[PDB]
């Protein structure tokens, strides 16, 4: 039983960075060279484990955390970063464990005239706590008066698209990102490497 | 109605502190990005740095390690602490309520300045 | 980094001319840009935002256009009021670079 990645890595669509998506993933083999190894991924950035020595460990649980961003932020998917995406979209903690893989994805999440499926949050009063997935669409207050739910003056839609066209400057192009976290617990080790 | 008043410039020598402070009224210094943008005398615009409302702070290449933005939420005032000035800093010193990286508004409101001479 | 070039430098035109003012971006930026417009003595004042947005309060003999690297302000009937100093201003990514200017004056 191999580990599902293929649908992790190959789905046809893929989350806004607000509404982030995470897959659990368990009880399987993971081959994780023929990914470290992999010509389509531009990022690659291991933490707390060795790339080349993710064969040989055994863990309770992976997560594979996937959503969109821009080129010029995938560096903000690292532990210790700051920034509108590591503050208020995806944050990993400063202990984190675990790889992030990033690659460029013009051809497939940008449009003529505009992509505008893909979001970010812009607005937020303080910044996420590691691996909080905050969906909220509630009108942000930006002065001392309600907003009743009306968009206006100090009074803003929280989130914004990106409008990923494919005229854009590489660093603003669109990057599909995968975030595999691994976790291990007191109890029994399902996901392991070919041994 | 919004209102943003700079004060704290005037003469300073050479190699000199500044601290400028913005006093705001009309919306939440501490919920917004607040920026400052200076323009020396004749010359065009330029940003110089932001604060988050989550508190991430950025600065131009040309301010890096001699300035620093902050707020006070109490007073709600933004400041510009400016450290080893020289002539080239010599400027009106605007601050503006919004942010200039992918912030679509742009900065929708600004004070009248304050202007900042380094001279000895 | 990002270029922003704007073109004229000045210009000089009669009450009731349509006006216009170019930005070119040396990469994409799709419509992350801004338009001000600067009097003497004043702040700059935001007229058109996300590239073709007017701000509140602004008439409407302003209107911005483009997107990617190609922007343009026009002003369709010039008014003594609005001699000033105009700015285009890229928002995609620090340091927020704004244009040269165009001076705008008026011919009489």
């Known amino acids: 039983n191999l580990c599902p990645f293929g649908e992790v890595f190959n789905a046809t669509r893929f989350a806004s960075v607000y509404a982030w998506n995470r897959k659990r993933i368990s009880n399987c083999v993971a081959d994780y060279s023929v990914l470290y190894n992999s010509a389509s991924f531009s990022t690659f950035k291991c933490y707390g484990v060795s790339p080349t020595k993710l064969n040989d460990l055994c863990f309770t649980n992976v997560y594979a955390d996937s959503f969109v961003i821009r080129g010029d932020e995938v560096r903000q998917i690292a532990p210790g970063q700051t920034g509108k995406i590591a503050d208020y979209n995806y944050k990993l903690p400063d202990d984190f464990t675990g790889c992030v893989i990033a690659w460029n994805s013009n051809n497939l999440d940008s449009k003529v005239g505009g992509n505008y499926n893909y979001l970010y949050r812009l607005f937020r009063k303080s910044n996420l706590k590691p691996f909080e997935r905050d969906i909220s669409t509630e009108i942000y207050q930006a002065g001392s008066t309600p907003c009743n739910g009306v968009e206006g003056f100090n009074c803003y839609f929280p989130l914004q698209s990106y409008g990923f066209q494919p005229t854009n400057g590489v660093g603003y192009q669109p990057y599909r990102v995968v975030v595999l976290s691994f976790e291990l617990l007191h109890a029994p080790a399902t996901v392991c490497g070919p041994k | 109605e919004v209102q943003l008043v700079e004060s704290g410039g005037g003469l300073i020598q050479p190699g000199g502190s500044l601290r400028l402070s913005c006093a705001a009224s009309g919306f939440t210094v501490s919920s917004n990005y607040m920026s400052w943008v200076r323009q020396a005398p004749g010359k065009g615009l330029e940003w110089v740095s932001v604060i988050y409302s989550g508190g991430a702070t950025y600065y131009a290449d040309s301010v890096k390690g001699r300035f620093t933005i902050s707020r006070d939420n109490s007073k709600n005032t933004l400041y510009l602490q400016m450290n080893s000035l020289r002539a080239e800093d010599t400027a009106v010193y605007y601050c503006?309520?919004?942010?200039?990286?992918?912030?679509?508004?742009?900065?929708?409101?600004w004070g009248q300045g304050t202007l900042v001479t380094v001279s000895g | 980094d990002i270029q922003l070039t704007q073109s004229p430098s000045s210009l000089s035109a009669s009450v009731g001319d349509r006006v216009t003012i170019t930005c070119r971006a040396s990469?994409?930026?799709?419509?992350?840009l801004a338009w001000y417009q600067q009097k003497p003595g004043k702040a700059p004042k935001l007229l058109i935002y996300?590239?073709?947005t007017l701000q509140s309060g602004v008439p409407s003999r302003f209107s911005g256009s483009g997107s990617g690297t190609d922007f343009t302000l026009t002003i369709s009937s010039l008014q003594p009021e609005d001699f000033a100093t105009y700015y285009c201003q890229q928002l995609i990514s620090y340091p927020g670079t704004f244009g040269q200017g165009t001076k705008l004056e008026i011919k009489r």
């Open positions: 990469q994409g930026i799709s419509s992350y």
């Open positions: 996300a590239a073709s």
């Open positions: 503006a309520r919004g942010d200039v990286s992918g912030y679509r508004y742009g900065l929708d409101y």
